[PDB]
Amino acid sequence: SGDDRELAILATAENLLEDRPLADISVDDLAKGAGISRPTFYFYFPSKEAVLLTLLDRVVNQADMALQTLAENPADTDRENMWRTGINVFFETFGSHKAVTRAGQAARATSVEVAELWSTFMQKWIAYTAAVIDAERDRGAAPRTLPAHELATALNLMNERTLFASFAGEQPSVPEARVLDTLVHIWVTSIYGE
Amino acid sequence: SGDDRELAILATAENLLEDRPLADISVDDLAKGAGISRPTFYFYFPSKEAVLLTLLDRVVNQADMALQTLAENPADTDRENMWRTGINVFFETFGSHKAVTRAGQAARATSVEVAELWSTFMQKWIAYTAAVIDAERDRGAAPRTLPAHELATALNLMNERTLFASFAGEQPSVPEARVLDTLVHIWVTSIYGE
Ligand SMILES: CC1CCN(C(=O)Nc2ccc(Cl)cc2)CC1
Numbered sequence: 001s002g003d004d005r006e007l008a009i010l011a012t013a014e015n016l017l018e019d020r021p022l023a024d025i026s027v028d029d030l031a032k033g034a035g036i037s038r039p040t041f042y043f044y045f046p047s048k049e050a051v052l053l054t055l056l057d058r059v060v061n062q063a064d065m066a067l068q069t070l071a072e073n074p075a076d077t078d079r080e081n082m083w084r085t086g087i088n089v090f091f092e093t094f095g096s097h098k099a100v101t102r103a104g105q106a107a108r109a110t111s112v113e114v115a116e117l118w119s120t121f122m123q124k125w126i127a128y129t130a131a132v133i134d135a136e137r138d139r140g141a142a143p144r145t146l147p148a149h150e151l152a153t154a155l156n157l158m159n160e161r162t163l164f165a166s167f168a169g170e171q172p173s174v175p176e177a178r179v180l181d182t183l184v185h186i187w188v189t190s191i192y193g194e
Numbered sequence: 195s196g197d198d199r200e201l202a203i204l205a206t207a208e209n210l211l212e213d214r215p216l217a218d219i220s221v222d223d224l225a226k227g228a229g230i231s232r233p234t235f236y237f238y239f240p241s242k243e244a245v246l247l248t249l250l251d252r253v254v255n256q257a258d259m260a261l262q263t264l265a266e267n268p269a270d271t272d273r274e275n276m277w278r279t280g281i282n283v284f285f286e287t288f289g290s291h292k293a294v295t296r297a298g299q300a301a302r303a304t305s306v307e308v309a310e311l312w313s314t315f316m317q318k319w320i321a322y323t324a325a326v327i328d329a330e331r332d333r334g335a336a337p338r339t340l341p342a343h344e345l346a347t348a349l350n351l352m353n354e355r356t357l358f359a360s361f362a363g364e365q366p367s368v369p370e371a372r373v374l375d376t377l378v379h380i381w382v383t384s385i386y387g388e
Protein backbone atom coordinates (compact mmCIF):
# COMPACT_ATOMS: atom_id res chain seq x y z
CA SER A 1 0.00 0.00 0.00
CA GLY A 2 2.98 2.37 0.54
CA ASP A 3 4.64 0.97 -2.52
CA ASP A 4 1.17 0.77 -4.05
CA ARG A 5 0.09 4.44 -3.56
CA GLU A 6 3.58 5.60 -4.60
CA LEU A 7 3.46 3.48 -7.79
CA ALA A 8 -0.03 4.81 -8.53
CA ILE A 9 1.19 8.42 -8.18
CA LEU A 10 4.02 7.67 -10.62
CA ALA A 11 1.74 5.91 -13.10
CA THR A 12 -0.75 8.76 -12.92
CA ALA A 13 1.96 11.38 -13.54
CA GLU A 14 3.38 9.50 -16.55
CA ASN A 15 -0.16 9.17 -18.01
CA LEU A 16 -0.98 12.87 -17.51
CA LEU A 17 2.35 14.02 -18.94
CA GLU A 18 1.30 12.44 -22.26
CA ASP A 19 -1.33 15.20 -22.70
CA ARG A 20 0.11 18.26 -20.94
CA PRO A 21 3.32 19.66 -19.46
CA LEU A 22 4.04 19.34 -15.77
CA ALA A 23 3.19 23.07 -15.26
CA ASP A 24 -0.45 22.27 -16.25
CA ILE A 25 -0.78 19.18 -13.97
CA SER A 26 -1.82 19.96 -10.41
CA VAL A 27 -1.13 18.01 -7.22
CA ASP A 28 -4.94 17.58 -7.04
CA ASP A 29 -4.80 15.96 -10.53
CA LEU A 30 -2.08 13.55 -9.33
CA ALA A 31 -3.85 12.70 -6.05
CA LYS A 32 -7.18 12.19 -7.87
CA GLY A 33 -5.66 9.86 -10.48
CA ALA A 34 -3.85 7.92 -7.81
CA GLY A 35 -7.04 7.57 -5.68
CA ILE A 36 -5.53 9.40 -2.62
CA SER A 37 -6.03 12.71 -0.86
CA ARG A 38 -3.77 15.74 -1.34
CA PRO A 39 -2.16 15.37 2.14
CA THR A 40 -1.56 11.68 1.45
CA PHE A 41 0.25 12.72 -1.78
CA TYR A 42 2.61 14.92 0.31
CA PHE A 43 3.49 11.90 2.46
CA TYR A 44 4.98 10.25 -0.63
CA PHE A 45 6.39 13.27 -2.55
CA PRO A 46 7.06 16.92 -1.61
CA SER A 47 6.09 18.29 -5.03
CA LYS A 48 5.06 17.36 -8.54
CA GLU A 49 8.67 18.15 -9.56
CA ALA A 50 9.87 15.35 -7.23
CA VAL A 51 7.46 12.92 -8.95
CA LEU A 52 9.01 13.78 -12.35
CA LEU A 53 12.53 13.34 -10.92
CA THR A 54 11.62 9.85 -9.71
CA LEU A 55 10.05 8.94 -13.10
CA LEU A 56 13.12 10.16 -15.01
CA ASP A 57 15.41 8.29 -12.60
CA ARG A 58 13.50 5.08 -13.28
CA VAL A 59 13.65 5.52 -17.11
CA VAL A 60 17.35 6.48 -17.19
CA ASN A 61 18.23 3.52 -14.98
CA GLN A 62 16.13 1.26 -17.21
CA ALA A 63 18.21 2.33 -20.21
CA ASP A 64 21.44 1.99 -18.25
CA MET A 65 20.56 -1.47 -16.99
CA ALA A 66 19.64 -2.59 -20.54
CA LEU A 67 23.00 -1.33 -21.82
CA GLN A 68 24.76 -3.24 -19.01
CA THR A 69 22.92 -6.41 -20.05
CA LEU A 70 23.99 -5.91 -23.62
CA ALA A 71 27.56 -5.26 -22.47
CA GLU A 72 27.53 -8.68 -20.69
CA ASN A 73 26.03 -10.56 -23.69
CA PRO A 74 27.97 -9.62 -26.86
CA ALA A 75 25.55 -10.08 -29.72
CA ASP A 76 27.60 -11.96 -32.36
CA THR A 77 27.85 -9.14 -34.77
CA ASP A 78 29.62 -7.02 -37.23
CA ARG A 79 30.95 -3.64 -35.85
CA GLU A 80 28.05 -1.80 -37.36
CA ASN A 81 25.47 -4.09 -35.73
CA MET A 82 27.35 -3.79 -32.40
CA TRP A 83 26.74 0.00 -32.38
CA ARG A 84 23.18 -0.26 -33.81
CA THR A 85 22.08 -2.67 -31.08
CA GLY A 86 23.60 -0.27 -28.46
CA ILE A 87 22.00 2.90 -29.84
CA ASN A 88 18.74 0.95 -30.07
CA VAL A 89 18.68 0.47 -26.27
CA PHE A 90 18.17 4.22 -25.94
CA PHE A 91 15.89 4.52 -29.00
CA GLU A 92 13.53 1.88 -27.61
CA THR A 93 13.76 2.71 -23.88
CA PHE A 94 13.25 6.45 -24.25
CA GLY A 95 10.88 5.96 -27.21
CA SER A 96 8.71 3.83 -24.87
CA HIS A 97 8.60 6.73 -22.37
CA LYS A 98 8.35 9.81 -24.60
CA ALA A 99 6.35 11.94 -22.15
CA VAL A 100 8.77 11.32 -19.25
CA THR A 101 11.69 11.86 -21.68
CA ARG A 102 10.33 15.20 -22.88
CA ALA A 103 9.35 16.47 -19.45
CA GLY A 104 12.68 15.30 -17.95
CA GLN A 105 14.69 17.12 -20.57
CA ALA A 106 12.73 20.35 -20.01
CA ALA A 107 13.22 20.06 -16.21
CA ARG A 108 17.05 20.13 -16.69
CA ALA A 109 16.70 23.96 -16.95
CA THR A 110 14.90 24.40 -13.63
CA SER A 111 15.97 21.44 -11.44
CA VAL A 112 19.52 20.99 -10.24
CA GLU A 113 18.65 17.42 -9.30
CA VAL A 114 17.36 16.60 -12.84
CA ALA A 115 20.37 18.34 -14.41
CA GLU A 116 22.80 16.36 -12.19
CA LEU A 117 21.02 13.04 -12.90
CA TRP A 118 21.21 13.54 -16.67
CA SER A 119 24.85 14.72 -16.41
CA THR A 120 25.83 11.70 -14.30
CA PHE A 121 24.33 9.19 -16.77
CA MET A 122 25.68 10.97 -19.83
CA GLN A 123 29.19 10.86 -18.30
CA LYS A 124 28.75 7.13 -17.69
CA TRP A 125 27.52 6.46 -21.26
CA ILE A 126 30.33 8.59 -22.74
CA ALA A 127 32.96 6.77 -20.64
CA TYR A 128 31.61 3.42 -21.81
CA THR A 129 31.56 4.60 -25.42
CA ALA A 130 35.18 5.73 -25.12
CA ALA A 131 36.20 2.38 -23.57
CA VAL A 132 34.67 0.50 -26.52
CA ILE A 133 36.35 2.81 -29.04
CA ASP A 134 39.65 2.26 -27.15
CA ALA A 135 39.16 -1.53 -27.42
CA GLU A 136 38.36 -1.28 -31.14
CA ARG A 137 41.60 0.71 -31.58
CA ASP A 138 43.64 -1.76 -29.49
CA ARG A 139 42.39 -4.71 -31.66
CA GLY A 140 43.32 -2.85 -34.91
CA ALA A 141 39.67 -2.37 -36.11
CA ALA A 142 39.49 1.41 -35.58
CA PRO A 143 42.16 3.97 -36.48
CA ARG A 144 43.72 6.25 -33.86
CA THR A 145 42.17 9.52 -34.97
CA LEU A 146 40.47 11.90 -32.46
CA PRO A 147 40.90 11.51 -28.71
CA ALA A 148 38.39 8.73 -27.99
CA HIS A 149 36.67 10.48 -25.10
CA GLU A 150 36.16 13.68 -27.07
CA LEU A 151 34.74 11.74 -30.06
CA ALA A 152 32.52 9.81 -27.63
CA THR A 153 31.27 13.02 -26.10
CA ALA A 154 30.22 14.63 -29.42
CA LEU A 155 28.53 11.40 -30.60
CA ASN A 156 26.56 11.02 -27.37
CA LEU A 157 25.52 14.69 -27.48
CA MET A 158 24.42 14.20 -31.11
CA ASN A 159 22.30 11.25 -30.03
CA GLU A 160 20.71 13.19 -27.18
CA ARG A 161 19.71 16.15 -29.31
CA THR A 162 18.77 14.13 -32.41
CA LEU A 163 16.74 11.44 -30.67
CA PHE A 164 14.79 13.87 -28.52
CA ALA A 165 14.11 16.24 -31.45
CA SER A 166 12.82 13.25 -33.44
CA PHE A 167 10.53 12.05 -30.62
CA ALA A 168 9.10 15.61 -30.20
CA GLY A 169 8.56 16.07 -33.97
CA GLU A 170 10.59 19.27 -33.70
CA GLN A 171 11.18 21.31 -36.88
CA PRO A 172 14.01 20.46 -37.69
CA SER A 173 14.27 16.82 -36.89
CA VAL A 174 15.12 13.43 -38.45
CA PRO A 175 11.90 11.33 -38.84
CA GLU A 176 11.67 8.78 -36.01
CA ALA A 177 11.63 5.94 -38.52
CA ARG A 178 15.00 7.17 -39.92
CA VAL A 179 16.87 8.19 -36.73
CA LEU A 180 18.54 4.78 -36.03
CA ASP A 181 20.02 4.47 -39.51
CA THR A 182 21.09 8.10 -39.43
CA LEU A 183 22.91 7.89 -36.09
CA VAL A 184 24.44 4.48 -36.82
CA HIS A 185 25.94 5.77 -40.05
CA ILE A 186 27.53 8.76 -38.32
CA TRP A 187 28.90 6.63 -35.45
CA VAL A 188 30.37 3.96 -37.72
CA THR A 189 31.94 6.35 -40.20
CA SER A 190 33.41 8.60 -37.49
CA ILE A 191 34.74 5.70 -35.34
CA TYR A 192 36.16 3.56 -38.17
CA GLY A 193 36.93 6.19 -40.83
CA GLU A 194 40.48 7.41 -41.44
CA SER B 195 18.78 59.12 -30.37
CA GLY B 196 15.99 56.57 -31.13
CA ASP B 197 18.52 54.27 -32.68
CA ASP B 198 20.92 55.43 -29.96
CA ARG B 199 18.75 54.62 -26.88
CA GLU B 200 17.67 51.34 -28.50
CA LEU B 201 21.31 50.35 -29.18
CA ALA B 202 22.23 51.30 -25.61
CA ILE B 203 19.43 49.07 -24.22
CA LEU B 204 20.74 46.17 -26.33
CA ALA B 205 24.36 46.75 -25.33
CA THR B 206 23.36 46.97 -21.67
CA ALA B 207 21.37 43.72 -21.85
CA GLU B 208 24.23 41.82 -23.54
CA ASN B 209 26.67 43.12 -20.88
CA LEU B 210 24.39 42.16 -17.96
CA LEU B 211 23.66 38.71 -19.39
CA GLU B 212 27.39 37.93 -19.02
CA ASP B 213 26.95 37.88 -15.21
CA ARG B 214 23.38 36.71 -14.61
CA PRO B 215 20.39 35.10 -16.34
CA LEU B 216 17.62 37.23 -17.78
CA ALA B 217 15.33 36.28 -14.83
CA ASP B 218 17.74 38.17 -12.48
CA ILE B 219 18.00 41.32 -14.68
CA SER B 220 15.25 43.88 -14.09
CA VAL B 221 13.84 46.48 -16.47
CA ASP B 222 15.22 49.05 -13.97
CA ASP B 223 18.69 47.47 -14.47
CA LEU B 224 18.34 47.80 -18.27
CA ALA B 225 17.01 51.38 -18.14
CA LYS B 226 19.76 52.41 -15.67
CA GLY B 227 22.55 50.93 -17.81
CA ALA B 228 21.13 52.52 -20.91
CA GLY B 229 20.82 55.96 -19.20
CA ILE B 230 16.99 56.19 -19.70
CA SER B 231 13.90 56.04 -17.51
CA ARG B 232 11.72 52.94 -17.11
CA PRO B 233 8.85 54.43 -19.20
CA THR B 234 11.33 55.40 -21.91
CA PHE B 235 12.50 51.73 -21.95
CA TYR B 236 8.87 50.65 -22.66
CA PHE B 237 8.78 52.97 -25.67
CA TYR B 238 11.54 50.86 -27.26
CA PHE B 239 10.70 47.34 -25.96
CA PRO B 240 7.63 45.81 -24.27
CA SER B 241 9.66 43.50 -22.01
CA LYS B 242 13.14 42.28 -21.19
CA GLU B 243 12.22 39.10 -23.14
CA ALA B 244 11.77 41.24 -26.29
CA VAL B 245 15.27 42.71 -25.77
CA LEU B 246 16.74 39.18 -25.71
CA LEU B 247 14.78 38.24 -28.86
CA THR B 248 16.25 41.24 -30.68
CA LEU B 249 19.81 40.39 -29.47
CA LEU B 250 19.47 36.75 -30.58
CA ASP B 251 18.05 37.86 -33.93
CA ARG B 252 21.07 40.09 -34.48
CA VAL B 253 23.59 37.30 -33.59
CA VAL B 254 21.85 34.60 -35.66
CA ASN B 255 21.68 36.94 -38.66
CA GLN B 256 25.36 37.81 -38.15
CA ALA B 257 26.24 34.12 -38.42
CA ASP B 258 23.92 33.65 -41.39
CA MET B 259 25.33 36.65 -43.24
CA ALA B 260 28.91 35.42 -42.61
CA LEU B 261 28.00 32.00 -44.02
CA GLN B 262 26.48 33.70 -47.09
CA THR B 263 29.72 35.62 -47.60
CA LEU B 264 31.70 32.43 -47.38
CA ALA B 265 29.29 30.76 -49.81
CA GLU B 266 30.00 33.57 -52.34
CA ASN B 267 33.81 33.41 -51.89
CA PRO B 268 34.95 29.75 -52.11
CA ALA B 269 38.13 29.54 -50.08
CA ASP B 270 40.50 27.52 -52.31
CA THR B 271 40.52 24.45 -50.20
CA ASP B 272 40.50 20.79 -49.66
CA ARG B 273 37.05 19.29 -48.71
CA GLU B 274 38.03 19.14 -45.08
CA ASN B 275 39.05 22.82 -44.99
CA MET B 276 35.79 23.73 -46.81
CA TRP B 277 33.74 22.29 -43.91
CA ARG B 278 36.13 23.58 -41.18
CA THR B 279 35.90 27.16 -42.45
CA GLY B 280 32.06 26.82 -42.51
CA ILE B 281 31.73 25.35 -39.01
CA ASN B 282 34.13 28.06 -37.84
CA VAL B 283 31.64 30.79 -38.83
CA PHE B 284 29.35 29.51 -36.08
CA PHE B 285 32.18 28.72 -33.62
CA GLU B 286 33.50 32.29 -33.86
CA THR B 287 30.19 34.18 -34.20
CA PHE B 288 28.42 32.45 -31.33
CA GLY B 289 31.68 32.16 -29.34
CA SER B 290 31.93 35.98 -29.56
CA HIS B 291 28.42 36.28 -28.08
CA LYS B 292 28.32 33.51 -25.47
CA ALA B 293 25.93 35.26 -23.08
CA VAL B 294 23.35 36.01 -25.81
CA THR B 295 23.86 32.45 -27.15
CA ARG B 296 23.21 30.87 -23.75
CA ALA B 297 20.27 33.08 -22.86
CA GLY B 298 18.75 32.64 -26.35
CA GLN B 299 18.94 28.88 -26.15
CA ALA B 300 17.27 28.86 -22.71
CA ALA B 301 14.48 31.18 -23.98
CA ARG B 302 13.53 28.57 -26.67
CA ALA B 303 11.57 26.78 -23.88
CA THR B 304 9.46 29.78 -22.89
CA SER B 305 9.24 31.99 -26.02
CA VAL B 306 7.45 30.89 -29.15
CA GLU B 307 9.16 33.73 -31.01
CA VAL B 308 12.67 32.58 -29.92
CA ALA B 309 11.80 28.95 -30.71
CA GLU B 310 10.53 29.91 -34.20
CA LEU B 311 13.61 32.09 -34.92
CA TRP B 312 16.02 29.28 -34.01
CA SER B 313 13.92 26.74 -35.98
CA THR B 314 13.83 28.97 -39.06
CA PHE B 315 17.62 29.46 -39.12
CA MET B 316 18.38 25.82 -38.37
CA GLN B 317 16.15 24.80 -41.32
CA LYS B 318 18.06 27.24 -43.54
CA TRP B 319 21.49 25.96 -42.39
CA ILE B 320 20.38 22.32 -42.79
CA ALA B 321 19.05 23.00 -46.31
CA TYR B 322 22.33 24.65 -47.27
CA THR B 323 24.31 21.76 -45.78
CA ALA B 324 22.22 19.27 -47.77
CA ALA B 325 22.71 21.29 -50.99
CA VAL B 326 26.50 21.17 -50.52
CA ILE B 327 26.43 17.44 -49.78
CA ASP B 328 24.28 16.98 -52.92
CA ALA B 329 26.88 18.91 -54.97
CA GLU B 330 29.73 16.84 -53.52
CA ARG B 331 27.81 13.69 -54.53
CA ASP B 332 27.05 15.03 -58.03
CA ARG B 333 30.81 15.77 -58.62
CA GLY B 334 31.79 12.22 -57.47
CA ALA B 335 33.60 13.36 -54.25
CA ALA B 336 31.04 12.00 -51.76
CA PRO B 337 29.30 8.62 -51.89
CA ARG B 338 25.51 8.31 -52.05
CA THR B 339 24.91 6.94 -48.58
CA LEU B 340 22.22 8.43 -46.26
CA PRO B 341 19.55 10.80 -47.54
CA ALA B 342 21.50 14.09 -47.64
CA HIS B 343 18.91 16.14 -45.78
CA GLU B 344 18.64 13.63 -42.95
CA LEU B 345 22.45 13.45 -42.61
CA ALA B 346 22.54 17.26 -42.68
CA THR B 347 19.93 17.46 -39.96
CA ALA B 348 21.78 15.16 -37.52
CA LEU B 349 25.11 16.94 -38.15
CA ASN B 350 23.61 20.38 -37.56
CA LEU B 351 21.86 19.16 -34.38
CA MET B 352 25.19 17.69 -33.21
CA ASN B 353 26.84 21.06 -33.77
CA GLU B 354 24.13 22.91 -31.88
CA ARG B 355 24.28 20.70 -28.82
CA THR B 356 28.06 20.21 -28.84
CA LEU B 357 29.04 23.82 -29.43
CA PHE B 358 26.67 25.21 -26.83
CA ALA B 359 27.66 22.58 -24.23
CA SER B 360 31.31 23.48 -24.84
CA PHE B 361 30.70 27.23 -24.48
CA ALA B 362 28.77 26.65 -21.19
CA GLY B 363 31.45 24.30 -19.77
CA GLU B 364 28.69 21.74 -19.24
CA GLN B 365 29.63 18.35 -17.75
CA PRO B 366 29.79 16.56 -20.22
CA SER B 367 31.26 18.67 -22.93
CA VAL B 368 34.13 18.78 -25.47
CA PRO B 369 36.73 21.43 -24.39
CA GLU B 370 36.23 24.62 -26.42
CA ALA B 371 39.76 24.38 -27.76
CA ARG B 372 38.95 20.89 -29.17
CA VAL B 373 35.38 21.37 -30.49
CA LEU B 374 36.33 22.47 -34.06
CA ASP B 375 38.58 19.48 -34.70
CA THR B 376 36.02 17.17 -33.14
CA LEU B 377 33.08 18.36 -35.25
CA VAL B 378 35.12 18.62 -38.46
CA HIS B 379 36.24 15.02 -38.10
CA ILE B 380 32.67 13.77 -37.66
CA TRP B 381 31.37 15.84 -40.60
CA VAL B 382 34.13 14.77 -42.98
CA THR B 383 34.02 11.10 -42.11
CA SER B 384 30.21 10.91 -42.24
CA ILE B 385 29.91 12.91 -45.52
CA TYR B 386 32.78 11.26 -47.42
CA GLY B 387 32.92 7.82 -45.78
CA GLU B 388 31.48 4.74 -47.47
C1 LIG C 1 28.09 1.91 -26.23
C2 LIG C 1 27.18 3.09 -26.52
C3 LIG C 1 25.98 2.74 -27.35
C4 LIG C 1 25.42 4.01 -27.93
N1 LIG C 1 25.12 5.02 -26.91
C5 LIG C 1 24.16 5.92 -27.18
O1 LIG C 1 23.37 5.76 -28.12
N2 LIG C 1 24.10 7.03 -26.40
C6 LIG C 1 22.97 7.85 -26.21
C7 LIG C 1 21.72 7.61 -26.79
C8 LIG C 1 20.65 8.43 -26.49
C9 LIG C 1 20.81 9.49 -25.63
CL1 LIG C 1 19.42 10.47 -25.27
C10 LIG C 1 22.03 9.75 -25.06
C11 LIG C 1 23.10 8.92 -25.34
C12 LIG C 1 26.09 5.16 -25.81
C13 LIG C 1 26.63 3.84 -25.33
Ligand SMILES: CC1CCN(C(=O)Nc2ccc(Cl)cc2)CC1
Nearest residue numbers: 280281284319323350353354357
Ligand atom coordinates in the same frame (compact mmCIF):
# COMPACT_ATOMS: atom_id res chain seq x y z
C1 LIG D 1 27.64 24.57 -44.82
C2 LIG D 1 27.46 24.36 -43.33
C3 LIG D 1 28.67 24.69 -42.52
C4 LIG D 1 28.54 24.04 -41.17
N1 LIG D 1 27.29 24.39 -40.49
C5 LIG D 1 27.28 24.36 -39.14
O1 LIG D 1 28.33 24.29 -38.49
N2 LIG D 1 26.07 24.37 -38.52
C6 LIG D 1 25.81 24.77 -37.19
C7 LIG D 1 26.80 25.24 -36.32
C8 LIG D 1 26.45 25.67 -35.05
C9 LIG D 1 25.14 25.63 -34.65
CL1 LIG D 1 24.76 26.22 -33.06
C10 LIG D 1 24.16 25.16 -35.49
C11 LIG D 1 24.50 24.74 -36.76
C12 LIG D 1 26.07 24.47 -41.32
C13 LIG D 1 26.32 25.10 -42.67
